[PDB]
Structures are given as structure tokens and as C-alpha cells.
Design an enzyme around this catalytic site. Structure first.
Site, PDB file in Angstrom:
ATOM      1  N   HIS A  13       0.830  -1.202   0.000  1.00  0.00           N
ATOM      2  CA  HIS A  13       0.000   0.000   0.000  1.00  0.00           C
ATOM      3  C   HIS A  13       0.874   1.265   0.000  1.00  0.00           C
ATOM      4  O   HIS A  13       0.648   2.196  -0.796  1.00  0.00           O
ATOM      5  CB  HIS A  13      -0.956  -0.035   1.192  1.00  0.00           C
ATOM      6  CG  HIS A  13      -1.626   1.272   1.503  1.00  0.00           C
ATOM      7  ND1 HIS A  13      -2.992   1.445   1.417  1.00  0.00           N
ATOM      8  CD2 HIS A  13      -1.129   2.449   1.961  1.00  0.00           C
ATOM      9  CE1 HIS A  13      -3.303   2.676   1.790  1.00  0.00           C
ATOM     10  NE2 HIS A  13      -2.189   3.310   2.108  1.00  0.00           N
ATOM     11  N   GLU A  14       1.875   1.291   0.878  1.00  0.00           N
ATOM     12  CA  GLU A  14       2.789   2.432   0.946  1.00  0.00           C
ATOM     13  C   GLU A  14       3.560   2.574  -0.352  1.00  0.00           C
ATOM     14  O   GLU A  14       3.794   3.662  -0.826  1.00  0.00           O
ATOM     15  CB  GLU A  14       3.769   2.279   2.105  1.00  0.00           C
ATOM     16  CG  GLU A  14       3.105   1.944   3.432  1.00  0.00           C
ATOM     17  CD  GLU A  14       2.094   2.979   3.857  1.00  0.00           C
ATOM     18  OE1 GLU A  14       1.188   2.634   4.638  1.00  0.00           O
ATOM     19  OE2 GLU A  14       2.211   4.144   3.426  1.00  0.00           O
TER      20      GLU A  14
ATOM     21  N   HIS B 249       1.577   4.542  -2.690  1.00  0.00           N
ATOM     22  CA  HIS B 249       1.716   5.980  -2.527  1.00  0.00           C
ATOM     23  C   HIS B 249       2.931   6.476  -3.288  1.00  0.00           C
ATOM     24  O   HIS B 249       2.902   7.539  -3.920  1.00  0.00           O
ATOM     25  CB  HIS B 249       1.838   6.359  -1.041  1.00  0.00           C
ATOM     26  CG  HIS B 249       0.544   6.310  -0.296  1.00  0.00           C
ATOM     27  ND1 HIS B 249      -0.611   6.892  -0.773  1.00  0.00           N
ATOM     28  CD2 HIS B 249       0.224   5.762   0.901  1.00  0.00           C
ATOM     29  CE1 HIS B 249      -1.585   6.712   0.104  1.00  0.00           C
ATOM     30  NE2 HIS B 249      -1.108   6.019   1.123  1.00  0.00           N
TER      31      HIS B 249
ATOM     32  N   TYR C 173     -11.756   1.701   3.836  1.00  0.00           N
ATOM     33  CA  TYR C 173     -10.734   2.697   4.122  1.00  0.00           C
ATOM     34  C   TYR C 173     -10.442   3.513   2.879  1.00  0.00           C
ATOM     35  O   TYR C 173     -10.105   4.689   2.971  1.00  0.00           O
ATOM     36  CB  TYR C 173      -9.439   2.065   4.644  1.00  0.00           C
ATOM     37  CG  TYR C 173      -8.366   3.112   4.838  1.00  0.00           C
ATOM     38  CD1 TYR C 173      -8.517   4.115   5.787  1.00  0.00           C
ATOM     39  CD2 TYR C 173      -7.227   3.128   4.044  1.00  0.00           C
ATOM     40  CE1 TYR C 173      -7.549   5.099   5.956  1.00  0.00           C
ATOM     41  CE2 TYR C 173      -6.248   4.104   4.207  1.00  0.00           C
ATOM     42  CZ  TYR C 173      -6.416   5.087   5.162  1.00  0.00           C
ATOM     43  OH  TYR C 173      -5.448   6.061   5.321  1.00  0.00           O
TER      44      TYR C 173
ATOM     45  N   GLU D 297      -5.576   7.674  -0.990  1.00  0.00           N
ATOM     46  CA  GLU D 297      -5.769   6.418  -0.284  1.00  0.00           C
ATOM     47  C   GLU D 297      -6.522   5.426  -1.185  1.00  0.00           C
ATOM     48  O   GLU D 297      -6.198   4.238  -1.226  1.00  0.00           O
ATOM     49  CB  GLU D 297      -6.521   6.631   1.028  1.00  0.00           C
ATOM     50  CG  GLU D 297      -5.893   7.665   1.974  1.00  0.00           C
ATOM     51  CD  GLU D 297      -4.523   7.266   2.509  1.00  0.00           C
ATOM     52  OE1 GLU D 297      -4.048   6.155   2.213  1.00  0.00           O
ATOM     53  OE2 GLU D 297      -3.916   8.077   3.238  1.00  0.00           O
TER      54      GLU D 297
HETATM   55  C1  56Q Z   1      -5.108  -0.717   4.735  1.00  0.00           C
HETATM   56  C2  56Q Z   1      -3.834  -0.036   5.202  1.00  0.00           C
HETATM   57  C3  56Q Z   1      -3.811   0.745   6.364  1.00  0.00           C
HETATM   58  C4  56Q Z   1      -2.616   1.366   6.770  1.00  0.00           C
HETATM   59  S1  56Q Z   1      -2.567   2.281   8.100  1.00  0.00           S
HETATM   60  O1  56Q Z   1      -1.211   2.373   8.573  1.00  0.00           O
HETATM   61  O2  56Q Z   1      -3.335   1.587   9.111  1.00  0.00           O
HETATM   62  N1  56Q Z   1      -3.088   3.719   7.739  1.00  0.00           N
HETATM   63  C5  56Q Z   1      -4.502   4.015   7.967  1.00  0.00           C
HETATM   64  C6  56Q Z   1      -2.234   4.830   7.205  1.00  0.00           C
HETATM   65  C7  56Q Z   1      -2.688   6.182   7.763  1.00  0.00           C
HETATM   66  C8  56Q Z   1      -2.008   5.044   5.704  1.00  0.00           C
HETATM   67  O3  56Q Z   1      -2.884   5.305   4.874  1.00  0.00           O
HETATM   68  N2  56Q Z   1      -0.719   4.975   5.372  1.00  0.00           N
HETATM   69  O4  56Q Z   1      -0.198   5.136   4.098  1.00  0.00           O
HETATM   70  C9  56Q Z   1      -1.458   1.199   6.009  1.00  0.00           C
HETATM   71  C10 56Q Z   1      -1.483   0.425   4.856  1.00  0.00           C
HETATM   72  C11 56Q Z   1      -2.671  -0.183   4.462  1.00  0.00           C
HETATM   73  F1  56Q Z   1      -2.683  -0.932   3.352  1.00  0.00           F
HETATM   74 ZN    ZN Z   2      -2.111   5.386   2.865  1.00  0.00          ZN
END
Ligand code: 56Q
Ligand code: ZN
EC number: 3.4.24.83
Length: 507
Positions: free
Chosen positions: A417-418, A421, A459, A466
Site C-alpha cells: 500500500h505504501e 503511494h 478505508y 488512499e
Molecule cells: C489498509 C492499510 C492501512 C494502513 S494504516 O497504517 O493503518 N493507515 C490508515 C495509514 C494512515 C495510511 O494510509 N498509510 O499510508 C497502512 C497500509 C494499508 F494498506
Molecule cells: Zn495510505
């Protein structure tokens, strides 16, 4: 020997020390053991009418940035606010999306006012780096004064006679090491049992441990309470400094290392527990192992990525009790990453990160205490603690081991996920190298998000950045059903992202 004889022997060892304590010294040790909580009456009295109302009817659970504890406190507040309405009203007011901006901005500042004065928590959260600008300066200096004074209190070692004649004990919640594997180290079918498969993993990766705060240990093993499934048995070193606490406890000096000697499943009163046998070693010994591992993981990944041999890319920012697992998991996380993402996307994006002196930071201290965040985020109310974070200004990915993410299976998915970004960042850069912005800020993606932003994870509805990242994550999941759901339920996003991927690889 005898539990009571052991107790009296250790107490006598520290008796002169105890008797020599000043009132001020005793007060400090008590404040250490029992943190000073915020008084909720003062908090609520400091709110405006509109703020009480806002807090009264607010969807509290839905935060990016509030801990379980903080969430629990705020609802203790909410009740008090609502303890003056109809019994019908309060019944209604909790049968009822995501947080509004007015709500979020409120909570981001209210967070700063509900923190207990908790010396051991400050030490754990900062890994001992107490100058980190993650709290008010005047309070920061207060912690520093208290900590230095406690350090000066703890001057007498356990000594050459007692150290190999006694064990000390600590009961611990599994979740305090990692909130992930806590829920799944206990057998879901029978809670009196330990999950054998998980346990073997946990065991294999748990070789050393750091205490950056002051461990409070029992002279005699104490029966487990709720959520106390880890039973540490600890052997001190002759020069380990400590203090006697009333009711048969010791407070240990901070900054010690522990080598994990053995981890076994044991039975106590018809429930299974995890015994952890640990030996106190110098902290510098463990830091050495961490630094060596840091060198090794960069050498390996510098090769596989085409980076110069001495690129500083991966950082181990490790200071707490589950230390070696943070190091071990970084290896796994990066293997999952290379496994589930095209090698040319990895290389292009990472080279961009490195061009900006970026890092992959794997840590067990809270993210506001990571320089790659705080140097670019002076306002504490804008600082974020979470499982993971991408910081464009430092081009860094931060990943916090001990916590659990919002609707996240494991750490590897968090990292991807990061990395999403980061892909967002780089695509936007390639577009306009001059005024360098995020591709999810483009008019195309804004409209895509206005239409499809509700179709993926809960989320993902948060905002464009996001949504993209969640879409990017699901698209590179090891479960191929998850990938298809993206193409199915959010086709334009799926296409948009593949476009950016193609565009980056061909640049
Ligand atoms: C689902 C998911 C949740 C998270 S997080 O760390 O819990 N989070 C809400 C943080 C603020 C976020 O957007 N960081 O980029 C991180 C990765 C992910 F894939
Ligand atoms: Zn994020």
C-alpha cells in the site's frame, strides 16, 4: 528456594538503598509505576458548546491516528457528555461511513490534550530518543528531567552473588509485542491452547529483545491475568542495575538487552502459556546484531535492485521488546514485495526514492518519532502514528511492526500500500517534473474517485491518494480473487493504475 525467602533476600540486598530514598525519589518511582491520567472533567470543561455537541455525537472508532486506548478514553468522555440526555436518546445515539473534515481536525487537536504523563510509555514510544519533537517542549523537558533522575536512582547492581541465584518474572500481553499475531497465537477453537504452527514461527524469529524503558518485574512468578499469555523468566547480569519496589518487585535500569534463550509452550492451571527464557546482555551487543543485519539487508537488496553498493536504503530503527522480529520481518516483507510487483516498476520507483535520499524504515517506535516524518511535520497535531506511512518530502516508506493496520491482513500488504503511494508520487512527477505533484491530484483521477471511490475497501473511501493506494494494494494481492474484484468493481481505477504503471516503466 522459597518464594518468601527469595523476596526477603532481595529486599535486604536493596534495604540501604530503599532507606536512603528521599521523598522526592519515592514520588518519582510511584509516578513511574502509576502514570498521571488526564482528568476528563477538566478536558470537557475546556470545550466549547459546539465542541461538546460535536464530541457528543461523533463516530469515534473511524480514526487513522487514534490508539485503542485513546479511543477508549474519548468514549469515557462522550458518555459523560451524554449523561444528561434521555435514556431513549443514548439508546438511539449508538445504533448509527468515514469522518468529516470538521470532525477529523477537531480530533487531531484534541489528541494533544488527552495524553497521560507516562514515563515508561514515552521511553517505549521514542525508543529512548526522548528529544524527538513529538510532544510539547515543556512536557518533553519534564520527561527528560524525570528520566535522568530515575537513572541516577538506579545505581546499585544486583551484584555478583545474587544474579545467577535468582530468576525474575514478567507477565505480558502477546499484543504488546505485535498486535497482529496476538489474535492468532491463541487457538480460536479452544482459548486454553496455543496455536502450534504460529508458535513455531514466533519462536524461530524471536532471538533478542531490547528494553528502552524501565522493566518492572516480579520477584516471584505471578498468576496470569486476562490477556497475560506470555510468562517471561529473566536472568539478570551481575552489573544489571535495579531497585526494590514494594510488594516484591524490581524496577530494572532502562537500555538493557535480552537474549532469548528458550521459548516453550507450558501448562499452568489447565491453560497453555508461552514461557520465554531471557538473559540480560549489554544493549550494545544487540545493537551490533541489528547494525550488522542492516548492512546485510542493504547489500543484498542493493545488488538485486541495481543500486550502488553502498546505497543506504533500508533502515532498522529498532529499540523495543520484539526487536529481532522487526529485523526478520523486513526480509519477509521485501520478498513479498519483489514477488508480487513487476521488477521494472520496483526498480524505477525505488531509484526515484533513492534520488531523493529516501528510506524504507522498519521500526518498533511510533512513527511521529521517526525523523523521515517529523523533520517535515513540525505540528504535532499533523503528525501521524499508524501501521504504515509514505512521506513524499523524504521519499520514505515507514512501517511500524507492533501495530495493526485498518483492515489489513499482514505487514507485507501494508508495505505494498505504501509503495502504492510512492507510485502515485513518481507518476505525478513524470507528468510534470517542474511543478511536481501527485498523479491522484490530476483531474482524471479526481473524477474517477468521485464515481468509483466507494466500491473498494471501506478505508479507500477516505480520499484520492488512499483510494489509489488501496486499489494498488488489492491489484497486487497474492490472492488472485482480490485482483479481479478491482477490475470488476472499479474498472476505470484498475485501468488508470495500469496506465500509470506502463507509463512509469516506459519513461
Ligand atoms: C489498509 C492499510 C492501512 C494502513 S494504516 O497504517 O493503518 N493507515 C490508515 C495509514 C494512515 C495510511 O494510509 N498509510 O499510508 C497502512 C497500509 C494499508 F494498506
Ligand atoms: Zn495510505
Amino acid at each position: 528456594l522459597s518464594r518468601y525467602e527469595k523476596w526477603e533476600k532481595i529486599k535486604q540486598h536493596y534495604q540501604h538503598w530503599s532507606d536512603s530514598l528521599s521523598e522526592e525519589g519515592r514520588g518519582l518511582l510511584k509516578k513511574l509505576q502509576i502514570p498521571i491520567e488526564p482528568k476528563k472533567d477538566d478536558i470537557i470543561h475546556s470545550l466549547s458548546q459546539e465542541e461538546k455537541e460535536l464530541l457528543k455525537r461523533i463516530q469515534i472508532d473511524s480514526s487513522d491516528f487514534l490508539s485503542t486506548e485513546e479511543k477508549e478514553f474519548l468514549k469515557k468522555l462522550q458518555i459523560d457528555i451524554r449523561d444528561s440526555l434521555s435514556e431513549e436518546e443514548k439508546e438511539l445515539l449508538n445504533r448509527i461511513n468515514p469522518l468529516s473534515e470538521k470532525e477529523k481536525e477537531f480530533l487531531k487537536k484534541l489528541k494533544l490534550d488527552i495524553q497521560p504523563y507516562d514515563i515508561n510509555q514515552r521511553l517505549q514510544d521514542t525508543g529512548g530518543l526522548i528529544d524527538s519533537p513529538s510532544i510539547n517542549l515543556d512536557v518533553r523537558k519534564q520527561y527528560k528531567r524525570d528520566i535522568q533522575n530515575i537513572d541516577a536512582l538506579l545505581h546499585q547492581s544486583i551484584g555478583s552473588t545474587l544474579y545467577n541465584k535468582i530468576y525474575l518474572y514478567e507477565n505480558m500481553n502477546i499484543n504488546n509485542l505485535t498486535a497482529t499475531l496476538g489474535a492468532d497465537l491463541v487457538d480460536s477453537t479452544d482459548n486454553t491452547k496455543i496455536n502450534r504452527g504460529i508458535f513455531n514461527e514466533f519462536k524461530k524469529n524471536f532471538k533478542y529483545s531490547i528494553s528502552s524503558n524501565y522493566m518492572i518485574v516480579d520477584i516471584n512468578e505471578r498468576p496470569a491475568l486476562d490477556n497475560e499469555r506470555l510468562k517471561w523468566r529473566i536472568q539478570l547480569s551481575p552489573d544489571t542495575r535495579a531497585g526494590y519496589l514494594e510488594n516484591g518487585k524490581l524496577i530494572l535500569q532502562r537500555n538493557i538487552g535480552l537474549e532469548i534463550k528458550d521459548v516453550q509452550i507450558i501448562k499452568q492451571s489447565e491453560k497453555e502459556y508461552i514461557r520465554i527464557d531471557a538473559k540480560v546482555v549489554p544493549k550494545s551487543k544487540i545493537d551490533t546484531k541489528i547494525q550488522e543485519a542492516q548492512l546485510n539487508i542493504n547489500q543484498e537488496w542493493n545488488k538485486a535492485l541495481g543500486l550502488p553498493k553502498y546505497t543506504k536504503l533500508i533502515t532498522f530503527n529498532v529499540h523495543n521488546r520484539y526487536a529481532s522480529n522487526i529485523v526478520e520481518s523486513a526480509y519477509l516483507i521485501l520478498n513479498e514485495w519483489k514477488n508480487n510487483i513487476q521488477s521494472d516498476l520496483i526498480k524505477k520507483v525505488t531509484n526515484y526514492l533513492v534520488d531523493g535520499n529516501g528510506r524504507f524504515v522498519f521500526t518498533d517506535i511510533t512513527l511521529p518519532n521517526i525523523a523521515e516524518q517529523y523533520t517535515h511535520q513540525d505540528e504535532i497535531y499533523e503528525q501521524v502514528h499508524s501501521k504504515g506511512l509514505y512521506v513524499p518530502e523524504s521519499r520514505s516508506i515507514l512501517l511500524h511492526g507492533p501495530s495493526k493496520g485498518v483492515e489489513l491482513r499482514n505487514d507485507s500488504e501494508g508495505f505494498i500500500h505504501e509503495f502504492g503511494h510512492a507510485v502515485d508520487d513518481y507518476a505525478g512527477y513524470l507528468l510534470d517534473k517542474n511543478q511536481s505533484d501527485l498523479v491522484t491530484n490530476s483531474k482524471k483521477f479526481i473524477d474517477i474517485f468521485k464515481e468509483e471511490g466507494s466500491n473498494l475497501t471501506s478505508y479507500g473511501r477516505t480520499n484520492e491518494a488512499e483510494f489509489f493506494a488501496e486499489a494498488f494494494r488489492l491489484m497486487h494481492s497474492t490472492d488472485h480473487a482480490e485482483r479481479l474484484k478491482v477490475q470488476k468493481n472499479a474498472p476505470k481505477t484498475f485501468q488508470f493504475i495500469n496506465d500509470q504503471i506502463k507509463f512509469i516503466i516506459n519513461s
